[PDB]
Amino acid sequence: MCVLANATFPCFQPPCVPCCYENNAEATLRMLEDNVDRPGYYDLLQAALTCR
Amino acid sequence: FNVYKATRPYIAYCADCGAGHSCHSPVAIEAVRSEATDGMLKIQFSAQIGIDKSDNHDYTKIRYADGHAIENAVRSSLKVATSGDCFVHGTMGHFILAKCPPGEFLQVSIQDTRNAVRACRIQYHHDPQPVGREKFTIRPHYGKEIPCTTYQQTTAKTVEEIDMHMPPDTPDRTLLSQQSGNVKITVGGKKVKYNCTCGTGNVGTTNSDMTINTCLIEQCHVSVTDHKKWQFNSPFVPRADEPARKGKVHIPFPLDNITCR
Amino acid sequence: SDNHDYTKIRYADGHAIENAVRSSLKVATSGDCFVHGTMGHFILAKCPPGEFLQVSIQDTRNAVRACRIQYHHDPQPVGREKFTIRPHYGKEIPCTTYQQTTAK
Amino acid sequence: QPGRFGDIQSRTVESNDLYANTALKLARPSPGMVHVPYTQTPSGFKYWL
Amino acid sequence: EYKTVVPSPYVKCCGASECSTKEKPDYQCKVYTGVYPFMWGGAYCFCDSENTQLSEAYVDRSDVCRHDHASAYKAHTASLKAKVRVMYGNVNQTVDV
Ligand SMILES: *[C@@H]1O[C@H](CO)[C@@H](O[C@@H]2O[C@H](CO)[C@@H](O)[C@H](O)[C@H]2NC(C)=O)[C@H](O)[C@H]1NC(C)=O
Ligand SMILES: *[C@@H]1O[C@H](CO)[C@@H](O[C@@H]2O[C@H](CO)[C@@H](O)[C@H](O)[C@H]2NC(C)=O)[C@H](O)[C@H]1NC(C)=O
Ligand SMILES: *[C@@H]1O[C@H](CO)[C@@H](O[C@@H]2O[C@H](CO)[C@@H](O)[C@H](O)[C@H]2NC(C)=O)[C@H](O)[C@H]1NC(C)=O
Ligand SMILES: *[C@@H]1O[C@H](CO)[C@@H](O)[C@H](O)[C@H]1NC(C)=O
């Protein structure tokens, strides 16, 4: 339920899966930023930074 | 789960950095939180603990920012003192837990990579009255248990959070040099923006070294625009973009109930 | 050698004149103080309130000799509020202090 | 009223509505400085304590 | 207790941002002209005097409000509730009434 551009992707499973931050830092920070008020934000922060 | 990758230490105005001279410090104290009835104080200082410059989570290193690069120092150089040498329990991120003797000011300091001390002092009353009906200094071998509220070590668990945002800019004169009537802007692998009012010079952003011909250093301007990392919302580093684009990060050490002798 | 170097602190022991490390110097009234200007027979310090004043220095034998005098030292900062450390927002009011000029 | 008991006000613990008169008279920044000066009546809850 | 969150001041370089008033408790809004910020390297804004800075602060509930908070109440007529121990002959029992 997190809104990036028009993705409307589910907050569990990132559109950039895996290693979102490693691909494009700026874009990831934007993606997180856009969904600050969404009640599900912390599924996006739980998905976005951490990766193997 | 290193949420600290995004984060970066910041250079924060510090009115009293020792000797009474105001200076721009790596360790500027930005909040003291004293809701713990035990006595522990949560200190908000500008430079994360235990997340090295390479973003590994090792604990012996305290990460801080100088210039624009991120350097690290030894953990064991951390010293907090209100009137006497305080005692630290908790360290993660920007938060340090300290138990301190009563005083009137509050100092935090760490040693630079060049083995020079850098500190910040703030005006904080800190006259802890321990719970109960007797102002005792240390706990006895015999007594009652009353509920005190204090900060634990459990690094995560919701509710309590801070606002991060994009580092605004970082004006520097190091990147500008004068090459025989031209202005040479080095980059050093970081995106750099310039506004030269030398006519043709024009404004713009680059990722690689260049220069502007027939211009003076005293007439141009330059600032490095990082966007990869993230910073604290701190009142002493300006904003970067209208109506605020504010991200969020969980903060360590929530408070909970403990038995207080 | 009467060189003006800063890293060295000169003192007398016996009838000979020896030196020691400059960073040895410690001033303390209640807690550790901070020294600003160290030159000649005179040392400038900003110090927290207390009742005594102790100055300390190591020998060539790395043994601490220090000595203490009784000084009240309850500094009242200028103006109409006693503050411990300077605020980040405030007025400028004229205080008188000692500067590092050796000159004139 | 500011300073006394009730500087902050809230119907329930989890309620969103909130009433505060803490007299936040933010002032002009000192020259040559980024900061945001604010002079504020301290929390009335500590005064009540 | 409250925490007076004050975000980083917007400093509009060579431009004027008039403060847009978002309703939040005790929200205090002002835009100042003539600022000249100085970050560590040097002045963040080239333009000499036409800089402005929009400084804004607002107060919210402290993070411990769930835990340390005084609750104000109104009391009406109360209901007594007792424990009575009663005894006759061989019966000896305590009840809540
Ligand atoms: C680059 O800097 C110049 C000035 O150093 C900015 O241009 C103008 O500066 C004059 C100086 O008096 C002001 O009167 C103008 O108001 C400024 N421009 C505008 C649009 O207000 C210029 O804006 C800077 N570069 C960028 C990209 O803004
Ligand atoms: C300490 O413990 C209490 C209960 O063991 C925690 O919960 C609150 O307790 C008070 C006591 O009357 C209740 O009024 C609240 O409704 C309780 N809160 C919840 C969410 O159930 C309390 O949170 C603990 N921590 C503290 C006080 O810091
Ligand atoms: C009547 O019943 C109660 C229920 O056990 C007996 O228990 C007494 O409880 C009181 C409570 O304060 C104690 O002080 C007594 O010591 C308890 N009695 C014993 C024997 O331990 C109570 O004693 C009974 N009454 C009689 C007269 O036997
Ligand atoms: C979202 O949808 C609009 C609708 O036309 C489109 O213009 C826009 O490009 C879309 N977003 C992206 C990132 O393409």
Short mmCIF file of N, CA and C and ligand atoms in Angstrom, two decimals, chain B residues 195 197 203, chain E residues 14 46-47 50, ligand 1:
data_model
loop_
_atom_site.label_atom_id
_atom_site.label_comp_id
_atom_site.label_asym_id
_atom_site.label_seq_id
_atom_site.Cartn_x
_atom_site.Cartn_y
_atom_site.Cartn_z
N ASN B 195 27.94 28.34 -9.11
CA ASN B 195 27.30 29.54 -9.64
C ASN B 195 28.38 30.59 -9.85
N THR B 197 29.31 33.96 -11.47
CA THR B 197 28.85 35.16 -12.17
C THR B 197 30.00 35.85 -12.89
N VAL B 203 25.88 28.59 -14.30
CA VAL B 203 25.71 27.70 -13.17
C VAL B 203 25.62 26.28 -13.68
N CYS E 14 18.24 33.93 -2.43
CA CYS E 14 17.83 34.89 -3.45
C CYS E 14 16.35 34.77 -3.81
N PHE E 46 24.90 33.05 -1.96
CA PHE E 46 25.69 34.09 -2.60
C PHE E 46 25.05 35.46 -2.42
N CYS E 47 23.76 35.58 -2.70
CA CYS E 47 23.14 36.90 -2.76
C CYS E 47 23.28 37.63 -1.43
N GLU E 50 19.39 39.70 -0.22
CA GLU E 50 18.03 39.32 -0.58
C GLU E 50 17.67 37.91 -0.15
C1 LIG F 1 23.58 32.62 -9.04
O1 LIG F 1 23.84 33.76 -8.36
C2 LIG F 1 23.18 34.90 -8.91
C3 LIG F 1 23.66 36.09 -8.11
O2 LIG F 1 24.96 35.85 -7.58
C4 LIG F 1 21.66 34.72 -8.89
O3 LIG F 1 21.08 35.68 -9.76
C5 LIG F 1 20.56 36.93 -9.27
O4 LIG F 1 21.36 37.74 -8.46
C6 LIG F 1 20.92 39.10 -8.47
C7 LIG F 1 21.95 39.90 -7.71
O5 LIG F 1 21.45 41.19 -7.37
C8 LIG F 1 19.52 39.18 -7.87
O6 LIG F 1 19.05 40.52 -7.95
C9 LIG F 1 18.57 38.25 -8.59
O7 LIG F 1 17.33 38.23 -7.89
C10 LIG F 1 19.17 36.85 -8.69
N1 LIG F 1 18.34 35.99 -9.52
C11 LIG F 1 17.05 35.72 -9.26
C12 LIG F 1 16.37 34.81 -10.23
O8 LIG F 1 16.47 36.20 -8.30
C13 LIG F 1 21.26 33.37 -9.46
O9 LIG F 1 19.90 33.12 -9.17
C14 LIG F 1 22.14 32.26 -8.89
N2 LIG F 1 21.86 31.00 -9.56
C15 LIG F 1 20.69 30.37 -9.50
C16 LIG F 1 20.59 29.08 -10.24
O10 LIG F 1 19.74 30.84 -8.88
#
